[PDB]
Amino acid sequence: DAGKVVDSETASICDAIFQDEETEGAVARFIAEMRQRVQADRNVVNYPSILHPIDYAFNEYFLQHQLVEPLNNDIIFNYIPERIRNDVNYILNMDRNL
Amino acid sequence: NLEELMRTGSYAQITNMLLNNQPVALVGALPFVTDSSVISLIAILDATV
Amino acid sequence: MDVLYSLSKTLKDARDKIVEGTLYSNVSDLIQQFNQMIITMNGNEFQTGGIGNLPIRNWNFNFGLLGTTLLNLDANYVETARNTIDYFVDFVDNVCMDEMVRESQRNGIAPQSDSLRKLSAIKFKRINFDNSSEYIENWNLQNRRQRTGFTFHKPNIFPYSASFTLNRSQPAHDNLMGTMWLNAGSEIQVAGFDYSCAINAPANIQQFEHIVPLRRVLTTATITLLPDAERFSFPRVINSADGATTWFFNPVILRPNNVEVEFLLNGQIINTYQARFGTIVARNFDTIRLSFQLMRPPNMTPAVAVLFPNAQPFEHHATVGLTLRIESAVCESVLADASETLLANVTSVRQEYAIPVGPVFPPGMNWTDLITNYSPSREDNLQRVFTVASIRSMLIK
Amino acid sequence: MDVLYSLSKTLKDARDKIVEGTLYSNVSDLIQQFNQMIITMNGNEFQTGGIGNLPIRNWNFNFGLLGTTLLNLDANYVETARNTIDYFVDFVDNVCMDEMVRESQRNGIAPQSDSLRKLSAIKFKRINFDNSSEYIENWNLQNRRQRTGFTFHKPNIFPYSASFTLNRSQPAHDNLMGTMWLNAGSEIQVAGFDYSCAINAPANIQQFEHIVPLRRVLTTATITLLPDAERFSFPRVINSADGATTWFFNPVILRPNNVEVEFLLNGQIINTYQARFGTIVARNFDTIRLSFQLMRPPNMTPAVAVLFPNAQPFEHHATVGLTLRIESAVCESVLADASETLLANVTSVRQEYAIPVGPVFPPGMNWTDLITNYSPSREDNLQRVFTVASIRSMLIK
Amino acid sequence: MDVLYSLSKTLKDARDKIVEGTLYSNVSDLIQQFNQMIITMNGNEFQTGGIGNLPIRNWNFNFGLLGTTLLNLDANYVETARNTIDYFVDFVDNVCMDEMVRESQRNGIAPQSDSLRKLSAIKFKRINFDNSSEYIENWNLQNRRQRTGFTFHKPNIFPYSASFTLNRSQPAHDNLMGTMWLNAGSEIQVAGFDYSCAINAPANIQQFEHIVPLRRVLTTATITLLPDAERFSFPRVINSADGATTWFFNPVILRPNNVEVEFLLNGQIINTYQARFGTIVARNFDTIRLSFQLMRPPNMTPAVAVLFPNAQPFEHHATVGLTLRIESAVCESVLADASETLLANVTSVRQEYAIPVGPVFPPGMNWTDLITNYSPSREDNLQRVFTVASIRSMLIK
Amino acid sequence: MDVLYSLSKTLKDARDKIVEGTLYSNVSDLIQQFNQMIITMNGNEFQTGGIGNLPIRNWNFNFGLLGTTLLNLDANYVETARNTIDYFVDFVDNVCMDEMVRESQRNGIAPQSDSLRKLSAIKFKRINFDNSSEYIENWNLQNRRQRTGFTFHKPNIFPYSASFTLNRSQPAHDNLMGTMWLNAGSEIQVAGFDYSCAINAPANIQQFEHIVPLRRVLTTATITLLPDAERFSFPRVINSADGATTWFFNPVILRPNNVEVEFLLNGQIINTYQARFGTIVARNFDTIRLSFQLMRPPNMTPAVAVLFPNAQPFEHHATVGLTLRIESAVCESVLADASETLLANVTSVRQEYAIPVGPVFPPGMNWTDLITNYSPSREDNLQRVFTVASIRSMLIK
Structure with a gap:
C-alpha cells in the first residue's frame, strides 16, 4: 500500500523480515499492510514503528509531553510584561500575521 | 488473485496447493509463450513453469 | 472423533471472537488456526x-484464506469469514447427524460413519486445537x-x-402384610404395610x-432421607397378581422406628447410618x-384403639x-442425566429420519429397557x- | 449493546488475571485491550x-496509560490496576442499573438509556472484545x-x-363425574374422578x-411420567363452580390403564406414547x-364389595x-428458569427503587400474569x- | 491457596491442550508458563x-525442561509432558487430601497442612496463571x-x-387445634389444624x-408457593412429648384464604406478599x-353438612x-446444595482414610448437626x- | 431476495424511461445499473x-453491452434495449412464479426454490439498486x-x-334470552335479544x-361505530343448535343503553368509550x-303497551x-385486505398451474381457515x- 515508516533502521528491519526464505507468510503480509493514516482535520497523524517495549514507552512519554503551545497574535500581545502595555507613553505595533 | 498474494506476501496457500497436487486456477495479467512445437507438448513442459 | 470437536470449538470461537473493533493481537492464534484448517x-x-x-449431500471446500489489518478489522473481512463459518457449521451439523444414526454390536469405540473415518486419518491430524470440554x-x-x-x-x-x-397372604385378601415399593427415576419410595x-x-x-440393585457404581453421592412416604399414603384399589381380582388398601402412617440405611459394595458393609435423616453422604x-421396623404403639388412646384391636377384622391398616x-x-460410566439435553437431542436426531430399532438400542430410544x-x-x-x-449441541443452539 | 458486555468481560478478566507474579506473556493481549479501551x-x-x-450520577474519565515494560507483575502495577478497576466496576454497575429498569412499548430491541445510546455510536465501537457467554x-x-x-x-x-x-353433576353435589388439574410451574397433574x-x-x-396449551415453542424436552397423581387423592372440601355451595370429596386411587399421551405441533400429531410410564422424550x-381410561374391575374381593356399590349411595369414588x-x-424465546437467577435479579433491581410502570411490563413482574x-x-x-x-451478574455478585 | 489453584489450572491446560499435530504458536504462552512453573x-x-x-509420602522435585524449538509437536514431546504431569497431579491431589483432613478452631483462613504453609511464602508466588474459577x-x-x-x-x-x-390441648387428645410443620431440605410444609x-x-x-428463622443472609431468591401441602394430607398417628401419649390426626384439606407471607430481615419488613401464588421472589x-386464616364455609351441602357436626363428637378434622x-x-456464604459435589467429596475423602473426628466438625460430617x-x-x-x-474436582473427573 | 427486487426495479425503470427522444443525462444512473447487471x-x-x-426452462444470459455515448436515444437503441428487457422480464416472471407456490413446514422465511438459492451467493450481492416499496x-x-x-x-x-x-332456553323456543353475532370481513355486527x-x-x-379476540395485535386504529344492527333486525327463522329443529325470530329494535366498548391489551385497560357512536380512535x-344493557321502556304509548305483555306469550321480541x-x-405481520392486489395474484398464480395442497397451507388457499x-x-x-x-406486481401489471 506504498506506506512510509518511522526510521531508516526500521526500513532495514522490514526489508530483512520481508526477505527471509525461512519465515512464514502471515508476518510478511502484516509487514506489507503497514501504512500511515493521516487525519489533517484534527492535526493528527499515525506512523508505524518497531521497538522494544522500553523504547516504545520512552518514545510515547517524549511524544505526550512536548513543550509547544498554540500561538496567536494576542498571545504575543500578552507576552510583553504588563507594566509596559498598561502605560500610555509606549505603543506596540505588529506587521505580520500568525 | 496473483497480485493480491504478491502484495500481501502470504505464499502458504499457493505453495500447499502446488505441492499437495490440488487443482487451482490463477488469475492475473500474464504474458504467455506461444509453443508451436508438438514435441514440446509431448514431453510435458506446462508442469514446471 | 477429535477433529469434529476441534471444528466445533474453533467455529464457535471464530463466530464469537471476530467482531468489528477488536485489536489484531486478540485473534492471532484463531486466525492462524483458521488458516491451517x-x-x-x-x-x-x-x-x-x-x-x-437424511438427504445425501456433497461437500467440496473451496474457500480461500483470511486477511488481516493492523489497527482494527473491517466488516467486509467479517462477512467473508462469516460465509465460510456458515458453510462449515452446515457441514459439521450434517456430519454429526450422519454419525448419530449408525451403531453395531462390534466395538463402538472406532468410528462408524464414513465421513468421520475419512476425517480421522493421519492426513488431517494437524487441525487439533484443544480439548477443554468435559465429554471430550x-x-x-x-x-x-x-x-x-x-x-x-x-x-x-x-x-x-x-x-x-x-x-x-390369604385367598380372601383381608390379612395382607408385606412390602410395597416404587423406585421411579431418581426417587425411591419403599412402604412396608401390615x-x-x-x-x-x-x-x-x-x-x-x-x-x-444398581448396574453401574456411584461415587461421592449425596442422598436426602425423609422418614415418610408422601406418595404411598392414599386409599387404593390395587390389582392382585392373579390378574382378575383386586384387593383394598387403606394406609395410616406412623413414625418409622429403627430406620437403617445401608450402602454395600459387592456384599461388603461400607456405610451405615442409624436414626439419621437429611442430606447424608x-x-x-x-x-x-x-431395613426398618413397624412397632405397635405402647399406649393407645380411643382414637387408636378403635383401629387396632385384638379382633380379626381390620379396615384402617x-x-x-x-x-x-x-x-x-x-x-464411572455415562448415564442419562437431567441437567443436560443430550438424550433429547439423540432421540430427536434418531426419530427425525425414521430409523427403525437397531440391533442395540431399544425401539423409540426408551431409556428403561436400555438401562x-x-x-x-x-x-x-x-x-x-x-x-x-x-x-x-455447540453450533446449532 | 455488546459494548457493555465487552466492558464486563474485560473488567472480570483484569480482576482475575492481573495478579502479581504472573508471566507477562500471558496477559499481553488483555493489557493491550485495557489500554486501548x-x-x-x-x-x-x-x-x-x-x-x-434511582439517584442521578455523573461520570468523567481521565487516566493515563498503564505499564507494559515489566516482566513480572509487582505490587505497584496491580495496585494501580485495582485502583482504576474499582472505578470502572462502579461505572459498569451504575450504568447497567440505570439502563435496566427503563422500559418502552416501541422498539424494545434498541438501547433505552442515555448511557447505552451514547456508548453505541461509531467511535466507541473499537472496544468490543468477545462474546463468550450464552445470552449475549x-x-x-x-x-x-x-x-x-x-x-x-x-x-x-x-x-x-x-x-x-x-x-x-347434581344440584346438591352428591354424584359427580369430572376432571381436576393443577397446572403450575413445570408440573401437570390431571385427575379424573367418577x-x-x-x-x-x-x-x-x-x-x-x-x-x-403452551404459550411458546419448545424443543428437545425430557418428560418424566409418574402414573399416579400426588395431589388429587386427599379428602377435600372444594367450592363449586357457581361459588354458592361447597361439596365433599373422598377419593380412592385406582391405577389408570390405556394411558395415551400425545404431543402436537401446529395442530398436527407428531409424537405418540402409549402405556409407557417413567421416562419419555x-x-x-x-x-x-x-387421554386416559378408567375401567371397572371385573371381579372383586370381600374388601372391595363395600367400595363400589351399584346402589344409590356414593361416598368413595x-x-x-x-x-x-x-x-x-x-x-427459542426467553422464559424464567429454575437453574439461574434472571427473573429474581430483574425483580430485585426493579423493586429496590420502585420505578413507576405503564402498560409495558406486568405489575411487579408477576410471572403468572406475564405468561x-x-x-x-x-x-x-x-x-x-x-x-x-x-x-x-458477571461483575457484581 | 490461590497458588494451588494456579498450579491446578496450569496442570489442566498442559494435560489437555498438549496434543499431537497442533501448532506450537498456540501454546507458546502455555509452554513458557509451564517451564516457569x-x-x-x-x-x-x-x-x-x-x-x-493418610499414607505418608515424600516428594523430591528433580526434573528437566520442555523444549521450545519444535515447529509442530510430536509424540515424544507428549510422552515427556505426561511423564511430568502425572507426578505433578499426584502431588496436587495428595496436597489437597492432606489439607482436607486438618482443621483449626481459630484462624481458618490460613493454611493448615505443611504443603500450603510452605506455598504461602513469597518465593512461590511466581505462578498465578489466572483466577477464572468462581470459588477461587x-x-x-x-x-x-x-x-x-x-x-x-x-x-x-x-x-x-x-x-x-x-x-x-386436652389429655384425652380428641379436641385439638395447633400447627404442624416439617422444615426438611429446601422445602417448607406448614399446616395448621383445628x-x-x-x-x-x-x-x-x-x-x-x-x-x-435462618442463620445466614439469603439474597435474590426465586420462591415457589403452592397451597394444600402434601405430607400432611393423610391420616397420621403421632406420639407426643409426654412420652406416654399417642393421638390420631384425620386431615381434611379445606381451602386457604388470605394467605400472608412476610420476608423479614433484622426484625424489619422488606418484602410482603398477599393473596398471591405461583412463583414469587x-x-x-x-x-x-x-400467616393464613382457616375459614368455615357458611354454605354447605348435606355431604358437607355431615362432615362438620355442631357438637363435640368429631368424625373428621x-x-x-x-x-x-x-x-x-x-x-454470601458457602452452602451445600443438591446441584454440586463439594461436601459429598469432602465427606468421602474424610471417610476414605478414616480420620478421627476433629474438635470443630461434628462427627461424620452430619449436615444437620453442622447447621x-x-x-x-x-x-x-x-x-x-x-x-x-x-x-x-478439576483434576479427577 | 433483495437482489430479485433490485432487478425488478431496474427493469421497471428501464420500461418507463427508455423511450425515443429522451436526454441521456436523465437516465444515466439507470443505464449504469443496467450495464452492471x-x-x-x-x-x-x-x-x-x-x-x-410449471415448465422446466433453461436460461442463459448472453446479451451484449449497451452503449452510453449517444446524446439522444434513437429507435435502434430503443429496440435493442426492449428485446433484452422483454427477455429479462420473462425470466423474472418465471422465477417468481416458481418461488410463489413452494413452502416448507420449518424455516419458511428462507428461500426454497433452486433459482432463489442460486441467486443468494456472495458475488451476486454486487447488484442492489433501490428498495423504495413498502414491502421491501x-x-x-x-x-x-x-x-x-x-x-x-x-x-x-x-x-x-x-x-x-x-x-x-326452552325446548319449544317460547321465551329466549341470549346473544347473536356476525363477525365477517372487516365489520362486526352483534345483537342482544330477549x-x-x-x-x-x-x-x-x-x-x-x-x-x-384477535390473533394478531393492531396499532393506530380508527373505528366507525353505529348503534343499529343492520342484519339482525328482520323477521328470521334459523335452525337451532339441536341440529334437527327450527325457531322463529321476531325483532323489534330499541336503542341500546349504556353502550360501553373496551379496547384492552394484555389484560390491561387501554381505552374506554361510553355514550359515543362513531369516528372514535x-x-x-x-x-x-x-358490553351493553337492555332496558324496559319506562313509559309507553298504548300501542307499545299492547305489544309487550306482562304475561308469558310474546308476539314480538x-x-x-x-x-x-x-x-x-x-x-407487524403481513395480512390481507380489500385494498391490495396481492392475495388475488397469489391465488391466481397458485390455482392456474394446479399446485397440490402443501403441508402447511390448507387446500384452496382459504383465508378464513388459514387465519x-x-x-x-x-x-x-x-x-x-x-x-x-x-x-x-411491478414487472407486469
Whole structure:
C-alpha cells in the first residue's frame, strides 16, 4: 500500500523480515499492510514503528509531553510584561500575521 | 488473485496447493509463450513453469 | 472423533471472537488456526447421509484464506469469514447427524460413519486445537484407560419398576402384610404395610427388608432421607397378581422406628447410618439395602384403639414409609442425566429420519429397557453417541 | 449493546488475571485491550439516573496509560490496576442499573438509556472484545435472524391455573363425574374422578380428556411420567363452580390403564406414547393432549364389595391421575428458569427503587400474569432486560 | 491457596491442550508458563501425611525442561509432558487430601497442612496463571475484606427439625387445634389444624402463625408457593412429648384464604406478599413468617353438612396446607446444595482414610448437626475446605 | 431476495424511461445499473420449474453491452434495449412464479426454490439498486430487527364465525334470552335479544357481554361505530343448535343503553368509550370487549303497551343493535385486505398451474381457515409469498 515508516533502521528491519526464505507468510503480509493514516482535520497523524517495549514507552512519554503551545497574535500581545502595555507613553505595533 | 498474494506476501496457500497436487486456477495479467512445437507438448513442459 | 470437536470449538470461537473493533493481537492464534484448517480441508471431498430420510449431500471446500489489518478489522473481512463459518457449521451439523444414526454390536469405540473415518486419518491430524470440554476430556482419558467419570445432577438411573411383595397372604385378601415399593427415576419410595398391627408377631414389631440393585457404581453421592412416604399414603384399589381380582388398601402412617440405611459394595458393609435423616453422604456403593421396623404403639388412646384391636377384622391398616432421593453423584460410566439435553437431542436426531430399532438400542430410544440391559458394548456405544451429541449441541443452539 | 458486555468481560478478566507474579506473556493481549479501551474512553462525560428513586450520577474519565515494560507483575502495577478497576466496576454497575429498569412499548430491541445510546455510536465501537457467554451470543444470533436457542432446567413455562370441570353433576353435589388439574410451574397433574365407577356409561370404561396449551415453542424436552397423581387423592372440601355451595370429596386411587399421551405441533400429531410410564422424550411440541381410561374391575374381593356399590349411595369414588413433569427443555424465546437467577435479579433491581410502570411490563413482574398474555414486544423487552441482567451478574455478585 | 489453584489450572491446560499435530504458536504462552512453573518448583522437598491413616509420602522435585524449538509437536514431546504431569497431579491431589483432613478452631483462613504453609511464602508466588474459577474468585474477594457471592440451585439452608406445637390441648387428645410443620431440605410444609372448624373461635375464623428463622443472609431468591401441602394430607398417628401419649390426626384439606407471607430481615419488613401464588421472589430476607386464616364455609351441602357436626363428637378434622420451595437463590456464604459435589467429596475423602473426628466438625460430617449450631469460624473453615475440594474436582473427573 | 427486487426495479425503470427522444443525462444512473447487471449476469446457467405444471426452462444470459455515448436515444437503441428487457422480464416472471407456490413446514422465511438459492451467493450481492416499496422496506427492517409496519384499508382480520349463544332456553323456543353475532370481513355486527323484554328481570335491566379476540395485535386504529344492527333486525327463522329443529325470530329494535366498548391489551385497560357512536380512535389494542344493557321502556304509548305483555306469550321480541367497523390499521405481520392486489395474484398464480395442497397451507388457499389457526410458520410463509407477489406486481401489471 506504498506506506512510509518511522526510521531508516526500521526500513532495514522490514526489508530483512520481508526477505527471509525461512519465515512464514502471515508476518510478511502484516509487514506489507503497514501504512500511515493521516487525519489533517484534527492535526493528527499515525506512523508505524518497531521497538522494544522500553523504547516504545520512552518514545510515547517524549511524544505526550512536548513543550509547544498554540500561538496567536494576542498571545504575543500578552507576552510583553504588563507594566509596559498598561502605560500610555509606549505603543506596540505588529506587521505580520500568525 | 496473483497480485493480491504478491502484495500481501502470504505464499502458504499457493505453495500447499502446488505441492499437495490440488487443482487451482490463477488469475492475473500474464504474458504467455506461444509453443508451436508438438514435441514440446509431448514431453510435458506446462508442469514446471 | 477429535477433529469434529476441534471444528466445533474453533467455529464457535471464530463466530464469537471476530467482531468489528477488536485489536489484531486478540485473534492471532484463531486466525492462524483458521488458516491451517482451510489449508488442510480444501480439496478433500466428503459425502454425508446415505441412510434413512437424511438427504445425501456433497461437500467440496473451496474457500480461500483470511486477511488481516493492523489497527482494527473491517466488516467486509467479517462477512467473508462469516460465509465460510456458515458453510462449515452446515457441514459439521450434517456430519454429526450422519454419525448419530449408525451403531453395531462390534466395538463402538472406532468410528462408524464414513465421513468421520475419512476425517480421522493421519492426513488431517494437524487441525487439533484443544480439548477443554468435559465429554471430550472423558473420551481422551478413556482412550488411555484411566479414571473416568461424569458429573450428574438428579441422575435418571433407576428403571421404572412398580412391584410389591408379600410375606403372608390369604385367598380372601383381608390379612395382607408385606412390602410395597416404587423406585421411579431418581426417587425411591419403599412402604412396608401390615394389617394385623403386629398383634401376632413376636415382640410386637414387624420387620420389613427391601433390596434394590444398581448396574453401574456411584461415587461421592449425596442422598436426602425423609422418614415418610408422601406418595404411598392414599386409599387404593390395587390389582392382585392373579390378574382378575383386586384387593383394598387403606394406609395410616406412623413414625418409622429403627430406620437403617445401608450402602454395600459387592456384599461388603461400607456405610451405615442409624436414626439419621437429611442430606447424608456415601463414599461409594453399588447396591442399596433398607431395613426398618413397624412397632405397635405402647399406649393407645380411643382414637387408636378403635383401629387396632385384638379382633380379626381390620379396615384402617397401618404402614410406615421411607423416602430416598439422590441429588448429585459422579459415575464411572455415562448415564442419562437431567441437567443436560443430550438424550433429547439423540432421540430427536434418531426419530427425525425414521430409523427403525437397531440391533442395540431399544425401539423409540426408551431409556428403561436400555438401562435394564446395560452391557459394556452398549456402554461404549452410548458414550460415543453422547460425545457426538455434545459436539453437535455447540453450533446449532 | 455488546459494548457493555465487552466492558464486563474485560473488567472480570483484569480482576482475575492481573495478579502479581504472573508471566507477562500471558496477559499481553488483555493489557493491550485495557489500554486501548482507556484511550478510547477518555474525555467523554456521561449522565446516569434521573428516573424514580434511582439517584442521578455523573461520570468523567481521565487516566493515563498503564505499564507494559515489566516482566513480572509487582505490587505497584496491580495496585494501580485495582485502583482504576474499582472505578470502572462502579461505572459498569451504575450504568447497567440505570439502563435496566427503563422500559418502552416501541422498539424494545434498541438501547433505552442515555448511557447505552451514547456508548453505541461509531467511535466507541473499537472496544468490543468477545462474546463468550450464552445470552449475549443468543442476542447476536437473533439480531441478524439466525435460529435461536436456550437451555433451561425445569423452567416455569406452564402458567398457574387451578380450575376444574365436571361432565355429570347434581344440584346438591352428591354424584359427580369430572376432571381436576393443577397446572403450575413445570408440573401437570390431571385427575379424573367418577362417582359411579362407569356403571351407567357404555363398556364400563370412562374416558377423561384434557388439553394444556403452551404459550411458546419448545424443543428437545425430557418428560418424566409418574402414573399416579400426588395431589388429587386427599379428602377435600372444594367450592363449586357457581361459588354458592361447597361439596365433599373422598377419593380412592385406582391405577389408570390405556394411558395415551400425545404431543402436537401446529395442530398436527407428531409424537405418540402409549402405556409407557417413567421416562419419555419428545423433539418438538406446542400442545399437550392427554387421554386416559378408567375401567371397572371385573371381579372383586370381600374388601372391595363395600367400595363400589351399584346402589344409590356414593361416598368413595374411583379416581385416577397422571403426573407430567419437564426436567429439561430448550426454547427459542426467553422464559424464567429454575437453574439461574434472571427473573429474581430483574425483580430485585426493579423493586429496590420502585420505578413507576405503564402498560409495558406486568405489575411487579408477576410471572403468572406475564405468561398469561404474551405479546412480542413484551418478549423483546424481557429478553433485553435478561441480557442486561446477565451482564450485571458477571461483575457484581 | 490461590497458588494451588494456579498450579491446578496450569496442570489442566498442559494435560489437555498438549496434543499431537497442533501448532506450537498456540501454546507458546502455555509452554513458557509451564517451564516457569517447573523452574520455580524444582529443587524443593515436600512432605505429606502423618495424621490419621493418610499414607505418608515424600516428594523430591528433580526434573528437566520442555523444549521450545519444535515447529509442530510430536509424540515424544507428549510422552515427556505426561511423564511430568502425572507426578505433578499426584502431588496436587495428595496436597489437597492432606489439607482436607486438618482443621483449626481459630484462624481458618490460613493454611493448615505443611504443603500450603510452605506455598504461602513469597518465593512461590511466581505462578498465578489466572483466577477464572468462581470459588477461587470468591476466596480472593474474601481475602481483601470485600463483598462475595454464590449462585445455587435449590440450596438446603433450612435446619432439619420435625416438631408440632398445640394451641389447644386436652389429655384425652380428641379436641385439638395447633400447627404442624416439617422444615426438611429446601422445602417448607406448614399446616395448621383445628378439630372444630372454628365453631367456638371468635368470628368463626381461626388465625394461624408460623415462624422459621435462618442463620445466614439469603439474597435474590426465586420462591415457589403452592397451597394444600402434601405430607400432611393423610391420616397420621403421632406420639407426643409426654412420652406416654399417642393421638390420631384425620386431615381434611379445606381451602386457604388470605394467605400472608412476610420476608423479614433484622426484625424489619422488606418484602410482603398477599393473596398471591405461583412463583414469587424477594430481594433480601433473613427469616420467613407465614400467616393464613382457616375459614368455615357458611354454605354447605348435606355431604358437607355431615362432615362438620355442631357438637363435640368429631368424625373428621380440618386443616390447610402450604408448600414453600426455594428453586434458585444467591448467598454470601458457602452452602451445600443438591446441584454440586463439594461436601459429598469432602465427606468421602474424610471417610476414605478414616480420620478421627476433629474438635470443630461434628462427627461424620452430619449436615444437620453442622447447621443447627452454625458459627462464623465453622463458616470460614467450610469455605476453605470447599475451595480446596473444588481445586481437587478439576483434576479427577 | 433483495437482489430479485433490485432487478425488478431496474427493469421497471428501464420500461418507463427508455423511450425515443429522451436526454441521456436523465437516465444515466439507470443505464449504469443496467450495464452492471448485464455484466454480472452474463455467463451463467439457470434451471426453473420442477413441480406442478410449471415448465422446466433453461436460461442463459448472453446479451451484449449497451452503449452510453449517444446524446439522444434513437429507435435502434430503443429496440435493442426492449428485446433484452422483454427477455429479462420473462425470466423474472418465471422465477417468481416458481418461488410463489413452494413452502416448507420449518424455516419458511428462507428461500426454497433452486433459482432463489442460486441467486443468494456472495458475488451476486454486487447488484442492489433501490428498495423504495413498502414491502421491501418492511422485509429489510424486519431482517435488521426494528419496528415493522404494513398499511391497510379495511383489513380483513376478523375470522368468519356466525355463531349465536342462548342462555335462557326452552325446548319449544317460547321465551329466549341470549346473544347473536356476525363477525365477517372487516365489520362486526352483534345483537342482544330477549323474548321477555326484561319483564321478569332484576329491575328491568338485562346485560349482554360479547368478547371477540384477535390473533394478531393492531396499532393506530380508527373505528366507525353505529348503534343499529343492520342484519339482525328482520323477521328470521334459523335452525337451532339441536341440529334437527327450527325457531322463529321476531325483532323489534330499541336503542341500546349504556353502550360501553373496551379496547384492552394484555389484560390491561387501554381505552374506554361510553355514550359515543362513531369516528372514535383507539391507539393500541389487541382485544375488543363490547358490553351493553337492555332496558324496559319506562313509559309507553298504548300501542307499545299492547305489544309487550306482562304475561308469558310474546308476539314480538326485543333486540338491541350494534355494529363496529375498523377503517385503517398498521400491523407487524403481513395480512390481507380489500385494498391490495396481492392475495388475488397469489391465488391466481397458485390455482392456474394446479399446485397440490402443501403441508402447511390448507387446500384452496382459504383465508378464513388459514387465519383460524394463524401460526408463526404460517406468518413467515405468508410474508415470503406476499413479498414475492409484490415484487412481481411491478414487472407486469
